[PDB]
């Protein structure tokens, strides 16, 4: 029931909708290269200009699978039927399976690159799953599972940042930088035990989610507009003298009424700094011990917090979340930017009173009774992020809409088993191979649908909102090119944000 | 009991006749190519001249098996013994099996094309079976199972028409064409789950038929000739004055008698239009919303209904069903055309009275009490067609003699599993392979034979009606060439139509 | 809608012979057949329904 | 079916009991389904000519009038000896006993 | 049943434009342009509906 | 007269029906009449008691 | 595919003000002015013939 | 908000905010009618603090 000429598993695909859950099944083709000659090599990268932003990182022979994005697990069909028709959803559990491996040898005689098969060569597969190693992954990075199947999936090399390159530069000195340099972890996935596989074998992995609900609902009014304008209130407002206009007290009108609920937090002050590349944030979170030397400017010490705004109506282009939707270029295109969902949550503002008229309050920290909703997700967003382990933390939502969880799905690592070749002087000289296989990620989504007492139709994602594109304009947004290709969504609101439709009474 | 050097199944062939059923078994050799580089590519084809007839279609990496024709499942021997000896027959059920796969790699160093074996490569096999995807297939198209075994069977690429190319051209304008463009399905067989197979595996599929009986019987008289000429009738005919000749009434003679039964429907009016290629029908069924622009003429909007005639004695060559019997050419040869079966059903006519003599009624729509029989089938006809799902329909028989059914046998799709190769820039660069295997289609035919009280011999298909052909004339119609080949039947009535023999009393 | 029926044309020919106004028949090509439409066809009366 | 070619073949209603000549009146539009909105166009010799009257013919396939929120649900099919296929062109569901 | 579904193509567009068909179309003389027969193209195909 | 869709569906509920579903037909109806009043009109002239 | 949004819809009332199905000032029940508000069936979803 | 869907000249921002607006009717829910010889009682529980 097994062997070389027996496929391990079949292709799996398609979404299956029910009332209480949804099952998305995706199979794709991947390949794995040698990645570094199998060495490790801590680089000390540096951008050169403008710098410093010096991260040294590390390299591994290992490659990894990144399943984190919605557009990987949903078709634009299936993810419309989800956005529409359902209010809450969260991933319940994941099941990954790797099978139908091939492992072929590359032959370079010069040109024509034979690509004969190699039967006895193995493939290492390690699923971390306890997060004992640096997480890799991270949101918004390309390498995710291809949005469109039948596309081969080229895995990416695994690396991590062992420490800040500044702070252990180290230059002249230090014993501060030297103590920071001399403490530095070095992780090797070979310390753990894992599985090697030949072409007749397979590996499967299971994952469960604690996670949180993704709320697809719209608020038609702010929390401050909840009241009956027809009813008089017993309340009094006192006003100073100014400016002649004798001070007086009077009861607040029925149409106006004090709210107990505050604008959500966000930081609208400052603005981005520096040339392209380098690092541009407007908020740079970092660490700078005393006696640390550290030379080059603030960029190398710190990371940067973007988006700062969260809620609060960013007031500028550079506070919005913006991505390119395609790995190829460019300056101005294509870039999706972002829009207000038209929900009355989000898009908030503060405006402290002063004396005449008002002035916007740029920095809104946490305050009691603040109420907001998380960034409206879209098909192109990452699903989860990893919440870093720490003693203390405030309330957790990231401003990119990801679901932070203690243990995300463990990263699955893979590399080509090293086949050496003999030599007189015993030199590295590995044998050149790659592998190809099929990963099937089947995730179950805990899902809840809606019932409303609204009389009116509300809103849906039609796809009559959508663009046209191709060599010639011709065929529509998600379809295919001439020739080509996969026509990308050009703007919002195609990509179909959550929270723009349905409704909820606050 | 399995492996690389173990054949999965053996060759199967031959027909087995009984009284209540017939079993035809056919095994053939096929091969499958890469088909598009594995991409999709919606073409926007267009004929160029004369046009417009603009269909854009789509392409898939997938290939498919088309079993729809009689000459694939019957030998001219076995299908004579069926035509003769039996009155009704219909397919009861189908069983398809794919096995003995090979999957070899093509090696181009330049010339000499090595063709080494590749053991671990897979093959995707998907049987739709619910008709969730566009049907492919369609009657009368070449690609069907080879009529003659020992012939390798080259599968054809799967594609479908997502929409009309006119009506979403779109030119300048529109929001009508734009709404039609922006709604357009894109189907991917990878959304469904299917099986991948290596060289030691196999797949089998079962199908059942609702279908309908194919009636092989001849009517020796029209339904209007059913009566006893010896018996007087009590009936009266009144005739106007004209034209002197005083109006009078008299009883209709015994030899003449009014029939309650009407000529079957058919459209003999108009005639074909336009140059070769383009589209030539004489009836163009299409759809043209208002405000649709659409530029080029009626061809691009509509398909065309041929044959229009059905019954009714086409009166012209261009209303007859005509096919070339061979994939190679030509203008005038060989082309089978068609003939009246000599059954008194079909070959009908209407001729409304007018005043003096008569005038042919060209368009005969549905009318009560119409009675006809379906187009006489032949060995070369398609078996079934797919009846499109719709709210309402009239009585269903297609005029090409196919059996329309709600669910035909589901199309079986197959393609080569994509094996990528590494590259520095991560470019498509698949590995070049093909596959070869054996399909065995075993279909059971529900069959009913005849008993007649006729004294006289009736008629059979002899094969003394048949032609001569080859390099030199030499050997007969269905045999083989010198050299060569498979000698084709040149005309009717070789190919042995149904309904030309036996008999039935109406 | 009004039920079906054929009110057009009208009867043709002398008494005896055949007089219908709709003559349903069969006429293959190359059939010779000499005498006129009456011998080929029967006739549908009543056409009206 | 058949793409009415004129305003006066379309289904049109006033949506309100109060008036009027031109308002408000909903008229009707093609659903953009490829069923409905049909046409025939017999060949003739050069170019084509629209076939105005399309009676029943074998192998005709269409779908019923696209319903809307404002349509009637059912109609009563009158009792009779014989009838052809039953769909009313206003989209109602004819049934023996409503 | 009240069927809420849309057809993206007419029933006449159901076929594979990539596949050649074995069928023949005959055309009269007119009008000079000698009468001829040829096989119908892959992109065009007779519909039974 | 209960015959119309806009009587039985809100534009909300009838969108959620149009969307999300392909076939639908009415299965059964239950009508109930209750809370009757039956008042007398009194015309003395104006003020209609 | 396609859905009935209600972003296709009109505006109406004494003053234009509030939307299609809502209510007037004063008033009323604002009526849908045209197609495709009233949300026809068969304009959305899809089916393979 | 009356601002934000005023709407004045323009907009498609205010118009999209105007065109999305709920309209609630307590008649959509089912409730009780009472005559002078009847009564209604209701219970409530508190999570509270």
UniProtKB/Swiss-Prot annotation, chain D:
The N-terminus of Isoform Minor capsid protein VP1, VP1u, contains a phospholipase A2-like region. VP1u may play a role in the disruption of host tight junctions in the airway tract. Belongs to the parvoviridae capsid protein family. Capsid proteins self-assembles to form an icosahedral capsid with a T=1 symmetry, about 26 nm in diameter, and consisting of 60 copies of three size variants of the capsid proteins, VP1, and VP3, which differ by the presence of an N-terminal extension in the minor protein VP1. The capsid has a channel at the 5-fold axis and there are densities extending the 5-fold axis into the interior of the capsid. The capsid encapsulates the genomic ssDNA. This is Minor capsid protein VP1. It comes from Human bocavirus 3 (HBoV3). The lineage of its organism: Viruses, Monodnaviria, Shotokuvirae, Cossaviricota, Quintoviricetes.
From Swiss-Prot, chain E:
Capsid proteins self-assembles to form an icosahedral capsid with a T=1 symmetry, about 26 nm in diameter, and consisting of 60 copies of three size variants of the capsid proteins, VP1, and VP3, which differ by the presence of an N-terminal extension in the minor protein VP1. The capsid has a channel at the 5-fold axis and there are densities extending the 5-fold axis into the interior of the capsid. The capsid encapsulates the genomic ssDNA. Belongs to the parvoviridae capsid protein family. The N-terminus of Isoform Minor capsid protein VP1, VP1u, contains a phospholipase A2-like region. VP1u may play a role in the disruption of host tight junctions in the airway tract. This is Minor capsid protein VP1. It comes from Human bocavirus 3. The gene is VP1. The chain holds residues 375 to 423 of 668 of the full protein.
